Amino acid sequence: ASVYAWNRKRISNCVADYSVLYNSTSFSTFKCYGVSPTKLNDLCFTNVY
Amino acid sequence: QCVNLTTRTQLPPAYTNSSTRGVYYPDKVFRSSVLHLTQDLFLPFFSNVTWFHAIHVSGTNGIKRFDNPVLPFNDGVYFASTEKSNIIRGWIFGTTLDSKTQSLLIVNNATNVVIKVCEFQFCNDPFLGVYYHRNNKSWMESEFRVYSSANNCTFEYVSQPFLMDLEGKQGNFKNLREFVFKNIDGYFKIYSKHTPINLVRDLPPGFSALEPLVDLPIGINITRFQTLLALHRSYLTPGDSSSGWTAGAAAYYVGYLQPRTFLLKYNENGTITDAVDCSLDPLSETKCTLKSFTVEKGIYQTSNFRVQPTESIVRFPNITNLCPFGEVFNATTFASVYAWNRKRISNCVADYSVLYNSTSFSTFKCYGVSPTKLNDLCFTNVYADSFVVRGDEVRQIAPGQTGKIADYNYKLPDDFTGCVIAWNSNNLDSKVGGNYNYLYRLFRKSNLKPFERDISTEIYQAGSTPCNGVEGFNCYFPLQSYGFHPTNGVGYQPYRVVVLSFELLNAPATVCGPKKSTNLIKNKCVNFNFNGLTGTGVLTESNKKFLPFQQFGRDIADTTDAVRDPQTLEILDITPCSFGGVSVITPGTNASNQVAVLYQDVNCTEVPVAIHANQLTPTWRVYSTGSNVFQTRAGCLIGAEHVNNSYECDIPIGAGICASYQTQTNSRSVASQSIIAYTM
Amino acid sequence: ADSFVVRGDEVRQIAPGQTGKIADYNYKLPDDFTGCVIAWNSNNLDSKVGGNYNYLYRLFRKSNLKPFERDISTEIYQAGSTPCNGVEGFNCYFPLQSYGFHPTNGVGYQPYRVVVLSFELLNAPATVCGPKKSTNLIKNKCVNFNFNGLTGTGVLTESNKKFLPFQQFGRDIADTTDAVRDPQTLEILDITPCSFGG
Amino acid sequence: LGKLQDVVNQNAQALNTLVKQLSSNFGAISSVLNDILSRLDPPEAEVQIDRLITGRLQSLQTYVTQQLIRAAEIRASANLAATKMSECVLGQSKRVDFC
Amino acid sequence: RLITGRLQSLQTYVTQQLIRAAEIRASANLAATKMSECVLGQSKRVDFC
């Protein structure tokens, strides 16, 4: 969706394995706030958008 | 055009003291009715000031000698003038004062000032001539006679003249004019004031506050300057060259600013009305240590405000071997990221200025060490760790960064304390058709530990079915190639990365910086910079025993107090450039000005050594030795005389001894009221 | 304003605590710049075909620059331990050099235009304000006032305080702005705390 | 000698702490001002220097508070001693177990 | 940072006030003893009054 109308999606019931998205794309920016990128593999969440 | 200067009667110029004048607002912040304490650049009180007569008066039987020297512009200049008929016009500032370097010019040819930042080619002895004489082609003439040419000019500023002019009343030397010039942060700041004086010479012991005048954003290197004279005698230099030095009377006073601590006081209007130089005498230091212009009767334990370090020394090991940055960065090929080559950089001088006309570093992110202070920081262990990656992954070379490269390939640690350098190399290892030689690991059963290398070449158990050593359905080869076609966007071009891991330790230096070495001061107060280690203090030879690999030894609580010189291998000892035991005994500011000094637990033989009288003002050297050399059991008491009487204690001093201000003017034939130090 | 054109890779060198070619020999941004650095790519404006070769840059210098300094020298660099006067000898290079903006290079070589604005907030009349508009003037209630780049909560009141012609605000005993001057009417106001704790 | 020694020791001990506490990092990268000044530029070393300054100033405040409390206790003891001197040496006391 | 500094200043002021209050309490106890021993009667203590 275009920036002026961005699509909001509720991610749920995952295990959130970022290792899957390695041989598909190269993230030019992965900047995290409040949560360290290193401690993302062992941090269960309660609401994701 | 210009005319030369055949002066022969030149004599060493006289000197005077800047009593209390030269105080300017050292900021732009408004302050009303407050006692502030700054330590910016100020002209010290009673400081030495050079007196120049410039022209030599031809009235006294005829003298035609011109003396216009070039003077240094060391970090601020105070300029005082006592002439009346615009004999001093303006100034020139610059580095070489030639056409090879830009310069600054200020001229007051009429009732408006002109400032130029051109590249004038100044002649040997610039001056200004024609002023005003009708029927001589000299009435209102804007001649220059100062520069031969001016090209590539940047800043021009024409505005209202600095101060009032004309009003020629010879014999009075009215309108004393004071200026302070300070070139900081590119800004050239001129602070100005004028007062209606009437004395002939020997500037009065008065206090003057210099209001700010201009802040020109010129941004040039200024180290020397000269004064512009008005040599008229009704036109320029009449006749042939020279023979035109007659201009009446000229005299200006020049002083140099030094870093000093002051106690400027503001009134309700925001105008500085009084100040205290916290270096001049113990009374001033006592005023500063408690922040008040009025000090009452008693003893006071002051802070340290006397000695300030004035010289800096640098001692680096004598190596003189340029580092093979060219042999590393300009390599034919780099190792792939999954197998990064580690190289021990040693015996270098680490001059980064070499790698300027070879590459443009896209990333120079330094951790633990600031990039600015890399030219003066000797190291003890350096590693290269070079590899080639994709552009989008260059951001993954970071301590707290995660990703494919930072989890399966490199995994920089959390205390890297090094510098990551990365530059694009799409024109060096991205041959047509795809390089396909720089490999990278894509699969791994776990993450990588910091500074680990995994040349595995195994089969990844991606699926829940053993597959031995063949590429099955869910069994992929772990490594994969990038492919550097010289047509991809900047997000796929090869980036070469070198991550240096410095190591600062108590070991002999191995990889230093481009900074050179200086001489070795051994008994004064200096700012020393030994191996990657700076500090202020006093060096001294010592008999300390040092281990062969040891470089420095600390105090009881982590304070390096004995360094080893890297050029002579001799052991030094650092003592603090401060002896805090000084107690000032005062009868109150509104009773007298004399004070007594009590240096703690020192006999009157080490006091000039203890407080470094050689680096102190003469007023302090007065309170270092002399006739009043009374010795007590709590350090001796230079400043007050000792009497055999046993009067009642008035001001406690130490163990038994007291002091008091007594009106001995009646008892003594000549000596007036004075401070005495009896026993209780 | 302080506008200039640099190479794309070097645009990261316009920073207070940064070092490099421009950061040591060309610009040398200070450590208290307290402004805003703007930079945008301009490969389509000053990168004519065949190479612009007009934007020069200094590469050699006997030392570094002081902050906010400009050096139009055009001298001969003493790179070697042999005097050479004013000719390009063996170890005597011309200090300045050209970039060359071919409109085909990667983004690491395309021209970037940089403007570094250096603001200055002082007790002086405002010169460059913002797009925010002005409102009415409450004179006896508890309001959040925003005078010239200066916000605060309190109660305003007319006062007989005497202000210098250039003065814009006056503070309390310990650095607390208590009397501001209205920019639209030039009259002197007085700020009292919107809190009486007794 | 007892308490007469103790107070002296206490004072000395306090001073020793005020020295031995100069090695506390207080959150800085290193509890050495010279090392920070040599390793980091002013704009980035400033925060570490303020950390060290705050830690050392808090240490000085703690030492001053301890000195004030000890001085109050010594003041009470000195008042008791002065009363004993002026009541049992300059006269005779009828107070039981006072002297 | 400002809040921490000002809170430390307030704590220092409160501690100084507490110490001064203790000293004043001791002085007030001495004054009350003198008031009830030398005004409401006669004291045989040497140099007490």
Ligand SMILES: *[C@@H]1O[C@H](CO)[C@@H](O[C@@H]2O[C@H](CO)[C@@H](O)[C@H](O)[C@H]2NC(C)=O)[C@H](O)[C@H]1NC(C)=O
């Ligand atoms: C002082 O000298 C300057 C040049 O050194 C004069 O500058 C120009 O002079 C011409 C004619 O004399 C004027 O038309 C210009 O307006 C002047 N300024 C500039 C920027 O060109 C100047 O006139 C002289 N006299 C003054 C400043 O009173």
Ligand SMILES: *[C@@H]1O[C@H](CO)[C@@H](O[C@@H]2O[C@H](CO)[C@@H](O)[C@H](O)[C@H]2NC(C)=O)[C@H](O)[C@H]1NC(C)=O
């Ligand atoms: C001042 O600098 C300029 C160049 O920055 C010199 O003037 C001419 O400038 C054009 C481009 O603007 C060049 O193409 C010419 O070659 C320059 N002329 C020369 C170099 O003679 C000017 O010479 C410089 N002035 C001085 C005194 O060196």
Ligand SMILES: *[C@@H]1O[C@H](CO)[C@@H](O[C@@H]2O[C@H](CO)[C@@H](O)[C@H](O)[C@H]2NC(C)=O)[C@H](O)[C@H]1NC(C)=O
């Ligand atoms: C170092 O090697 C050990 C042993 O091979 C690794 O531990 C294994 O890790 C895998 C995947 O995490 C597990 O499936 C195995 O059960 C582990 N075995 C043992 C004996 O621990 C360890 O992960 C390796 N470490 C690194 C950083 O590669």
Ligand SMILES: *[C@@H]1O[C@H](CO)[C@@H](O[C@@H]2O[C@H](CO)[C@@H](O)[C@H](O)[C@H]2NC(C)=O)[C@H](O)[C@H]1NC(C)=O
């Ligand atoms: C590096 O510099 C040091 C001086 O800092 C040199 O030491 C000199 O050694 C010679 C031979 O013993 C003496 O004659 C000199 O007097 C010494 N230095 C001085 C000036 O006092 C040393 O030789 C130099 N070479 C290296 C690389 O060690």
Ligand SMILES: *[C@@H]1O[C@H](CO)[C@@H](O[C@@H]2O[C@H](CO)[C@@H](O)[C@H](O)[C@H]2NC(C)=O)[C@H](O)[C@H]1NC(C)=O
């Ligand atoms: C400002 O000019 C002075 C004088 O030209 C420069 O000082 C010179 O610096 C070079 C290289 O650092 C030395 O080789 C000279 O011996 C120095 N001479 C003097 C008299 O100091 C100074 O470096 C310049 N500053 C800037 C920022 O350009």
Ligand SMILES: *[C@@H]1O[C@H](CO)[C@@H](O[C@@H]2O[C@H](CO)[C@@H](O)[C@H](O)[C@H]2NC(C)=O)[C@H](O)[C@H]1NC(C)=O
């Ligand atoms: C700034 O602009 C305002 C615009 O409103 C000016 O306020 C007006 O001033 C005129 C003349 O005194 C009055 O007739 C209007 O009624 C005012 N309008 C209001 C409500 O503000 C103000 O005078 C201007 N100030 C300056 C210094 O230019």
Ligand SMILES: *[C@@H]1O[C@H](CO)[C@@H](O)[C@H](O)[C@H]1NC(C)=O
């Ligand atoms: C990665 O994806 C590409 C795209 O299809 C594929 O050709 C390649 O085999 C994949 N590599 C691995 C290790 O799965």
Ligand SMILES: *[C@@H]1O[C@H](CO)[C@@H](O)[C@H](O)[C@H]1NC(C)=O
């Ligand atoms: C996206 O999905 C399509 C079809 O599902 C597939 O062909 C393509 O390879 C996928 N791309 C990536 C990057 O996963």
Ligand SMILES: *[C@@H]1O[C@H](CO)[C@@H](O)[C@H](O)[C@H]1NC(C)=O
């Ligand atoms: C100022 O310095 C000169 C030497 O340059 C010296 O002769 C003079 O005595 C000093 N000041 C005075 C007036 O004592």
Ligand SMILES: *[C@@H]1O[C@H](CO)[C@@H](O)[C@H](O)[C@H]1NC(C)=O
């Ligand atoms: C003075 O004479 C010298 C010759 O030694 C010359 O170089 C210089 O330019 C002359 N000064 C002026 C102002 O012409």
Ligand SMILES: *[C@@H]1O[C@H](CO)[C@@H](O)[C@H](O)[C@H]1NC(C)=O
């Ligand atoms: C300063 O100079 C004056 C003479 O101009 C002299 O009377 C005075 O004593 C000097 N003061 C000092 C201490 O320099």
Ligand SMILES: *[C@@H]1O[C@H](CO)[C@@H](O)[C@H](O)[C@H]1NC(C)=O
């Ligand atoms: C402040 O300036 C005003 C205006 O001239 C003047 O009347 C007043 O006396 C000044 N106050 C002081 C303390 O100089």
Ligand SMILES: *[C@@H]1O[C@H](CO)[C@@H](O)[C@H](O)[C@H]1NC(C)=O
């Ligand atoms: C780098 O190495 C190449 C090898 O041919 C050489 O030509 C070049 O001058 C060297 N310098 C550079 C460009 O770094």
Ligand SMILES: *[C@@H]1O[C@H](CO)[C@@H](O)[C@H](O)[C@H]1NC(C)=O
């Ligand atoms: C950089 O090196 C190249 C190739 O030797 C040369 O043509 C160019 O003039 C050099 N530029 C500078 C100023 O170092």
Ligand SMILES: *[C@@H]1O[C@H](CO)[C@@H](O)[C@H](O)[C@H]1NC(C)=O
């Ligand atoms: C000094 O004391 C005298 C006498 O009390 C008094 O008249 C004068 O105003 C006082 N001056 C100062 C500086 O306090």
Ligand SMILES: *[C@@H]1O[C@H](CO)[C@@H](O)[C@H](O)[C@H]1NC(C)=O
């Ligand atoms: C140093 O001071 C002590 C204190 O009395 C004294 O005994 C000793 O002689 C002094 N030193 C010298 C060298 O006079």
